Amino acid sequence: SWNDVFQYETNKVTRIQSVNYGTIKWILHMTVFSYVSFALMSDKLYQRKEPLISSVHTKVKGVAEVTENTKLVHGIFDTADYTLPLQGNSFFVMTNYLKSEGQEQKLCPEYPSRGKQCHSDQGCIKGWMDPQSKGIQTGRCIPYDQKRKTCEIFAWCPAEEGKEAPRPALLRSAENFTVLIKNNIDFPGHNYTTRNILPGMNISCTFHKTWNPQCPIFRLGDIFQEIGENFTEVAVQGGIMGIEIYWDCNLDSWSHRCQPKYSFRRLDDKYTNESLFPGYNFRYAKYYKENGMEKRTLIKAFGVRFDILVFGTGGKFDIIQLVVYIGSTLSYFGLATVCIDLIINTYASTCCRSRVYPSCKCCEPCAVNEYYYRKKCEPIVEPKPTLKYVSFVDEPHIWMVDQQLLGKSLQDVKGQEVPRPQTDFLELSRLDSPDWCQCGNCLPSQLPENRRALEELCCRRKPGQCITTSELFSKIVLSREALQLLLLYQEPLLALEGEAINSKLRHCAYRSYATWRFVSQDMADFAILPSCCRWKIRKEFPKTQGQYSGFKYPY
Amino acid sequence: SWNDVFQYETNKVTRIQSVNYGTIKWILHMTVFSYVSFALMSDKLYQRKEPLISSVHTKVKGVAEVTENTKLVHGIFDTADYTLPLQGNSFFVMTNYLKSEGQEQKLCPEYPSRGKQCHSDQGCIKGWMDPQSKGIQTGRCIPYDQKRKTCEIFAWCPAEEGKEAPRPALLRSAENFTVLIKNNIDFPGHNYTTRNILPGMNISCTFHKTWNPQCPIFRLGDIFQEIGENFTEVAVQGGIMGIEIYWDCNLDSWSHRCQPKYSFRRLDDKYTNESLFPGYNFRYAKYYKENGMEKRTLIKAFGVRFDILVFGTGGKFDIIQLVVYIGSTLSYFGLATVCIDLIINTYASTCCRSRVYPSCKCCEPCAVNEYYYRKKCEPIVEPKPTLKYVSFVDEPHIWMVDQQLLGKSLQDVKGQEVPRPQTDFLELSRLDSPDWCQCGNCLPSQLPENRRALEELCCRRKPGQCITTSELFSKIVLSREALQLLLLYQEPLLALEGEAINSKLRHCAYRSYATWRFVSQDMADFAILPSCCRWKIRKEFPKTQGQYSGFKYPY
Amino acid sequence: SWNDVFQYETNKVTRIQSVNYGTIKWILHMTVFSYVSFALMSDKLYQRKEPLISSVHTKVKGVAEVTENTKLVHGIFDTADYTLPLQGNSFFVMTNYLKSEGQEQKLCPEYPSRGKQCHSDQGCIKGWMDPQSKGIQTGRCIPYDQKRKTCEIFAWCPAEEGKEAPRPALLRSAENFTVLIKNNIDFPGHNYTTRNILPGMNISCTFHKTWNPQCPIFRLGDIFQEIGENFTEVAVQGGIMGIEIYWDCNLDSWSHRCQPKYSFRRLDDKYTNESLFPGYNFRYAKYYKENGMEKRTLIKAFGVRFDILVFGTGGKFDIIQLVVYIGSTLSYFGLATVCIDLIINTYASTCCRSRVYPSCKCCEPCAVNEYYYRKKCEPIVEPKPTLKYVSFVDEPHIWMVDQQLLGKSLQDVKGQEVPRPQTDFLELSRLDSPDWCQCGNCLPSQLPENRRALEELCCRRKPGQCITTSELFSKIVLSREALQLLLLYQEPLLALEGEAINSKLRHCAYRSYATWRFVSQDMADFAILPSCCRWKIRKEFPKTQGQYSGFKYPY
């Protein structure tokens, strides 16, 4: 069994000197290789990709001059006046405000915003909380001014909720403010970190997608203008703007590159329903005790929230990824074999000559695929007991019968026609009768009736001379000298005495007939001799005791 | 060499008409195809997936009525009173508070919380910072009330740290508050963006996992109740709640779909140790100068922080992903071949007939695999110098010797038994002696002693008649006419003169014996002639000058 | 066609008893298997990986004692005095501050920071906004102190912008503060959630990478010291520090593990340009009305922003991932076949014996690959009309001509030399003349001139005796008895009358010569008979009417 370990199996192959097939093979191989390499390079499937972790630090610069009114009030706003302490992934710049000073808890008329003007105390509801007004209704319609009256609410008073944002925006100058963004990223798996500002960078730059695509200083109005948004209009009610920072980073030494790409995107819907809080604002309150009364000053601050969104991946060569990709793509290199074998097996079909070629004679030279097919494939048949082969001297083909004989004579049974194999020319280049019978020599079978129909076969389908009348039958089958010579060839020291030699000669005659007619040993093994030939052989080599056994299943 | 380019190699194959094998093959092919397709469709391995980038904007609605006590104090809380300006990925709603007004830097008794009541100045430590009390101890135990005394600390005074949160929570009405969540997402690789609110959506809706699973307006109490949490109890000390927004988005036109799925999850541990800050609170201070004294008002605000967590992927068809998947799965289509070849090579074994079949005769019909194996495999042996083949007329098999001869005669040397090949019946269907010897005809070798044992072989293992006594030996081996005919067949214009013709006839006789006995040319090449036959041949075709060279290694 | 369904094709293979090839095959198989398994286990390519979603809750503990100056002012700072309400992914600890109390809108001298000292009103610019000073210049150079004068600005006054941060930092004690971090993560795809604090954990612990690598309580100074950063110096101007929490989590039951790894990283550049806002600070304003004047108190707060960065993946077994990996790696198991077949086809080359072996005789035993190659490959040639084979009795090889004959005689045409196939020894082990001619027997062709050169071939290249003079030619080719015997073998009941039998005998003689000389039937089919032999055959079997057709293309 140890030799069973030291075995190598290699496939048998046939080789063709064909220009067409070799050319097609190499073309397909090159195509597969080119696509595989292109995909590998384009998608960098040799790399392991890791997402980044980011930190953002922002700084806003700018002073706004605000002139508002009775009297002309001039003032300015600095960063502490329009920005919040947060300086990370988001920052807020106030662009407009409404302020209510000295609020007190008490009853006051609800502000007459859209559809808040009541006509009778029936319209008002006692105890009902109005989230819009931010107070509790007392169910009384009371005057708000000379020509309007509204529901009385308990709230911080005076209540200006629902008041329209001032137009134009008070902090319009914010269009001209600048923000510096510092972005630190890291790929912890690859142990790589970098930042968006490097030594030698200019500090007086201002971002431009063309001239200065790497300056991290942005004018807000320019941010809006780059994407077709009007800062002046958004400043009235506010909005949300995104600054996207994309890092497509290659961390391989021979191709190292990691720099940010900046882009902008509005994040609030422009056509938001008035009931879904259009824009962006928040209310900030300060609380103080004055005159023994606890009071509140509220500012409703409209502005733009800038969301800084940082995303990306870092790639570095990984051998396991490349190995997996190559394995995934290796099987595509059998395309040439699949296609050319398909061509060979398709043009080897007979129908491709009888029908296709007459219509199109350009494909006539493609008949050589029959030769390739016969040199490539060896068809064989499952050797099961009902398998039988018969040959008729009148006909040139062989007939295969692969069904049980339900009493019907094998002569009458139909069968699948198959070609007669060609005998090797090298080896050849040497020196009252039964109704089913018509050769005048067959005899009734001598087996049990259950299996008598097997031996009820003749040498031909039509009346004529028996095959055994030929001298070849006696030369090959009944020539005792030839059979003894064959047996001696197999058993040099054979003893020619007894009935055993007679049986051996009878079997050799059966084999000789079967090999002469069916040629192939696979067919010869399952062949069936005609009754005439069988009984002639048996008469030439009689069996003293017992009746003849007949054909036996080799398996 | 150019013709070497234009070559196509195709594998030689044998074909079997078998119902069982074809059925198994197609079943396995269909199984592999079905699993591959199912996996591709289920996991959408034809798609490239990209993670989303998100922006969240929240708005809380609701007014709380608070009645607290000496006197009955009625007041209300609006959004500016219980929410912070931040409206992004997280928002905070105050549900309870403790307020300390008019704090001053001075010495005060430490608040008598759990285990903070001292009995003597020894318990207190001078200069020690207590993070719980948030002051510096002076090492003196001083009275706090009539019946308790605590360590004196320098801190903002009066100090109420450690005071229990009021129960029930003052802002319980917050259960009935609502929040509107607006979520904007983008897949920048796929250049796709959408939002969680679309035109035509109802505004008076309230979220429900069944009735309104797409309304982005949520009642906080409902959020808690959906996951078995009690808002009333959490409101006392606070907590953290997660609102998860999942985007499983398909961006293919024929299957386009991108909508959010909402879900809730508590993020703070319910059974947190009292020493690990259970709940959620923060302390907010306002500073003011009154009476020339700089004072502080501190509010300890308990509440629920809502964390909005947005995650998901967007898939779109990619040809390279599909190609990689198909390549990864192509090799699974050789399963049918592997399994059926395994069956053929396993049932071709001899042991599978001698032992297995008697126990189970259902497997008797599976002996046909021997035929398939012999039609599929051609075993060959490495042709190395020690390779030899011998045949004995008494025995029916061949004996292979593959070891060096250490003086021992080849007759005595043991060998591996191998079958005698079958001669093509088509070609056959034609017209004082040494101790190791027992045929009475062998002679001692005439080589040098170092290699004499090679030629010390007989024609049989047991006493009997020599093979050469048969007429076949003279007909085939010693028939000068036959050998001349063979030589002329190979060399039509051969000259029959000199000793060269004698040598050629001797070699042809050796070849004829080797082909007759061993049949196969692979075995014939490495065969060894018996001494009797060899010396008989040499006598029939004597060599005038020199001793005979003997067997030569073909390689 | 139904039988076409029930077919199984298996490859024909040859088997070699070789120790070297089997050993190499098993070594390569084991190598491929070992690498595949190692990669699968190391990279856990059987797992589907999901990114986590995180929530962070922080709590800072500590009290700072600050003694600052005229008079000695002693005070303390608690969490509400140096922390902001936010307690999520980032938190801020104030380490230094500059405070400006009682600011008013009015004109004031610009603070004399680096290069802000003007000498004349020309240096100042009217109406220019200075983001550094945060005011509007009036274009007047006015005194700031006794020995310096600066540009007058309208701003919040007094303006201290540009003033140096105090050194040493006032809140140095913050080195000794602690922060507790609570981190909740979830893998929603795998439906797994955990947290960084579990029951039974010690509460008095403090983080250490060696002793306490799992305590989520961190001293800030220790955070800095672990990565070689000086808290004392960073406290003056501030900075940003990252606390990274990595979750490498395996969610398989047999290998379950999910715990955090903590690490630190400075996120602000240490060598930042003074014009790019080095450090970290923000300005916070409180607004109040005093004496009827609206005033502002501004604090410029320097400190450390701590960014808590949480990242990681969770893996769980997926069958589809494993199936894809196995399919991707299956094709690597053909390496043994590729390599050994390459060896066989490379050492089967002739040049590898004539040249390589003499230089290196260690490779002499590798000549056995010629036997393997001839037992493995069957070369065949495309059967196209110009294909011809010729043989010359003087020469021992065959000559293939694969080009059109442009009138030149086939005798003169050159051709590709090919070996003569070996005849099966088993079958063999039996009983005025044209200028191009030199055998004295050839005759001019009798075809049309367009195709006469095909038949203008002789039996030899050099003068000598004709092949047909041999008795073998008459025995094999002209033996009428042998040809009739062959025809009867193929057609047992053949009728020997008419000219049809003569034509059959002529064709059989052509076939016999072609098989005798070219041996292979593939070459015999396209062989060309010499004129001498052809005309001798035709004379022996004359054609009564019509001229002889000649060679015909089989396809």
Ligand SMILES: Clc1cccc(-n2nnnc2NCc2ccccc2Oc2ccccn2)c1Cl
């Ligand atoms: Cl969004 C935001 C961010 C940061 C701070 C604030 N707050 N909070 N309280 N006040 C402000 N800003 C200042 C201010 C706002 C409106 C009206 C008057 C006013 O005072 C003056 C007086 C003179 C010149 C300039 N401003 C806000 Cl609302």
Ligand SMILES: Clc1cccc(-n2nnnc2NCc2ccccc2Oc2ccccn2)c1Cl
């Ligand atoms: Cl968490 C948070 C978010 C947003 C704001 C605050 N702040 N900061 N300072 N005050 C508040 N809210 C108001 C307030 C809280 C407690 C007690 C009294 C009180 O005032 C009144 C008086 C009458 C009616 C209602 N409230 C906080 Cl603590």
Ligand SMILES: Clc1cccc(-n2nnnc2NCc2ccccc2Oc2ccccn2)c1Cl
């Ligand atoms: Cl960053 C930040 C976070 C949180 C709060 C604040 N604010 N905002 N306003 N004041 C503070 N802190 C308090 C304070 C800061 C500087 C000087 C004096 C001072 O008051 C006293 C008085 C006695 C003892 C201690 N402090 C800031 Cl600046």
Ligand SMILES: Nc1nc2c(ncn2[C@@H]2O[C@H](COP(=O)(O)OP(=O)(O)O)[C@@H](O)[C@H]2O)c(=O)[nH]1
């Ligand atoms: N192929 C084939 N073999 C046959 C046929 N008849 C007999 N045999 C073989 O010949 C043997 C039986 O010969 P037979 O003389 O009838 O048996 P006997 O009773 O021992 O004399 C069996 O092994 C059969 O395989 C036949 O028609 N075709």
Ligand SMILES: Nc1nc2c(ncn2[C@@H]2O[C@H](COP(=O)(O)OP(=O)(O)O)[C@@H](O)[C@H]2O)c(=O)[nH]1
């Ligand atoms: N297979 C085989 N070949 C043999 C044997 N003896 C001789 N030969 C072959 O015959 C040739 C030598 O014949 P021999 O008459 O001894 O050589 P001589 O000295 O030239 O006459 C060699 O090429 C051998 O391959 C044998 O026993 N077996």
Ligand SMILES: Nc1nc2c(ncn2[C@@H]2O[C@H](COP(=O)(O)OP(=O)(O)O)[C@@H](O)[C@H]2O)c(=O)[nH]1
């Ligand atoms: N291979 C080969 N075949 C030949 C040659 N000459 C004739 N044939 C074959 O012999 C047949 C023609 O024989 P021929 O006597 O000339 O034809 P006829 O006119 O019917 O008598 C054709 O089918 C040819 O394939 C030859 O030189 N080589």
Ligand SMILES: *[C@@H]1O[C@H](CO)[C@@H](O)[C@H](O)[C@H]1NC(C)=O
């Ligand atoms: C922005 O700056 C330009 C140039 O100084 C000025 O013309 C423009 O009016 C400014 N915009 C606003 C809104 O003040």
Ligand SMILES: *[C@@H]1O[C@H](CO)[C@@H](O)[C@H](O)[C@H]1NC(C)=O
């Ligand atoms: C931008 O908005 C402002 C305010 O409504 C308006 O005056 C101005 O014309 C707008 N500009 C454009 C280009 O729409």
Ligand SMILES: *[C@@H]1O[C@H](CO)[C@@H](O)[C@H](O)[C@H]1NC(C)=O
């Ligand atoms: C919530 O609203 C319902 C219906 O108005 C009311 O019955 C309930 O008391 C409210 N909850 C609280 C805590 O006020």
Ligand SMILES: *[C@@H]1O[C@H](CO)[C@@H](O)[C@H](O)[C@H]1NC(C)=O
């Ligand atoms: C919820 O908590 C409150 C406060 O402790 C309690 O009164 C109420 O019974 C609780 N409800 C449930 C269902 O546990």
Ligand SMILES: *[C@@H]1O[C@H](CO)[C@@H](O)[C@H](O)[C@H]1NC(C)=O
């Ligand atoms: C930190 O604490 C240690 C031990 O109490 C003390 O020696 C050191 O001075 C403290 N650091 C500062 C900056 O106060």
Ligand SMILES: *[C@@H]1O[C@H](CO)[C@@H](O)[C@H](O)[C@H]1NC(C)=O
């Ligand atoms: C840390 O910084 C402080 C402030 O500059 C300095 O006094 C101290 O020597 C520094 N320590 C080290 C180790 O550099």
Ligand code: NA
């Ligand atoms: Na594969």
Ligand SMILES: [Zn+2]
């Ligand atoms: Zn008959």
Ligand SMILES: [Zn+2]
């Ligand atoms: Zn008959």
Ligand SMILES: [Zn+2]
């Ligand atoms: Zn002997």
